[PDB]
Design a protein around this ligand. Structure first.
Ligand code: NAG
Ligand code: NAG
Ligand code: NAG
Ligand code: NAG
Lengths: 123, 123, 123, 123
């Protein structure tokens, strides 16, 4: 039921468009983040994901990576596609944002965490 | 300088292998984990990732998603590839391991978080 | 403006109650969780916390530790107390829920991470 | 066996001194962090914790909060006290660092995560 394929929106108002999945559960798409942590003109950026195939079909877990075209960072999302009842799909995801640092010494503070809620876009 | 391409081993005995790396930053690979949260014999699994090429640094950040073959769960990693003083490449990484719940009421207890340091296996 | 002192409820039906608040920032309280990762009847548990008073902001950050009475685990929370537009105080919070492993080889799989938004219960 | 009480050190070289625990498993102590995320003269700061009492004695989980006297943030640690074999104690902890933001709007990026290893101090 729960199909990643399509267009979704967030609670911060971010939007994401996701291609078609495969036998291997692969997919690609694009991301437009509403917010940034960098002082630097936001752009549409790419994602590469995967969606689990094993028997838990109905509501699968998944995860993608986003390659900021406008910053030196990377973000990764992972979560589950749910169907409340209505037949309303919801992505419940949690993500990790890695920033660039110049010496391993700094590594310690390069990782931020948090959530995101996605539901789909009309029309 | 620091590249994803190759065989790597991490502090827990897990090994993975990367390869591709478009001019995009995309790469696929396989990952063989030493460990698990599940009670099913481990099987090589595939991974999909990306490398940041913005302001082409000698230590880019990255991130990948491991689509577990033996489980219904998913793991995502992000980090940086640094060039340590020894002259050695080190992957400092962090992750979320998302597993499946049967109901969206149990979401809150589905995501684990941890660290991993990768090193080159090849001699 | 925003103070920890009181009864609060969060998006999962859990309630807690704070009280103290030295000139230090220390406070104790009790917490009654609606939810659990364990299979043992829940019992009110105590908490110990602190409030930042550096550059006495109207929205200080804080953090507390809930010493579960019904479990062998521990939870820690941190966040900020904000004054929302409505004029309402909101506790935006994030947590780690650490549980016990019998062997240090299983460490890597012991810590969960999540979010919680607290609101005032009192009328 | 594993007693929080005493003086410990970190992998980043941070030191911490921990008072005596109670029946309620409480404790207090002081922290000297080797590193900071703020441009602001490091100081010895206080912690308030708790250490679980329920039957899992030998190696207990625990958690403390640190009230930076020199910044607007808070950090929280939670983890387990281990005894490899030697009779060497090790704290394996993971922590959450909350920074101050000026509008709930920003909340999204105020949380950093990571680890820390503690072993004790001679003499
Ligand atoms: C997301 O899509 C909606 C649909 O109309 C649009 O109004 C909004 O501006 C988009 N926002 C971003 C940040 O892409
Ligand atoms: C890593 O590679 C070695 C070498 O063959 C293998 O024995 C080990 O099982 C691999 N690690 C795991 C646990 O998959
Ligand atoms: C929160 O308070 C209410 C009111 O008595 C109570 O019924 C509820 O159980 C408390 N929540 C939990 C699950 O502890
Ligand atoms: C920690 O304690 C050791 C013990 O001699 C000392 O040399 C070191 O400077 C201390 N470091 C900090 C950051 O407190």
């Amino acid at each position: 039921k729960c199909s990643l394929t399509g267009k979704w929106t967030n609670d911060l108002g971010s939007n994401m468009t996701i291609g078609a999945v495969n036998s291997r559960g692969e997919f690609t798409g694009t991301y437009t983040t509403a917010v940034t942590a960098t002082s630097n003109e936001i752009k549409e950026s790419p994602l590469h994901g995967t969606e689990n195939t094993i028997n838990k079909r109905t509501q699968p877990t998944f995860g993608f990576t986003v390659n900021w075209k406008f910053s030196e960072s990377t973000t990764v999302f992972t979560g589950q596609c749910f169907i409340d009842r209505n037949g309303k799909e919801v992505l419940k995801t949690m993500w990790l944002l890695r920033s660039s640092v110049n010496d391993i010494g700094d590594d310690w503070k390069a990782t931020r965490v948090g959530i995101n809620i996605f539901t789909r876009l009309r029309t």
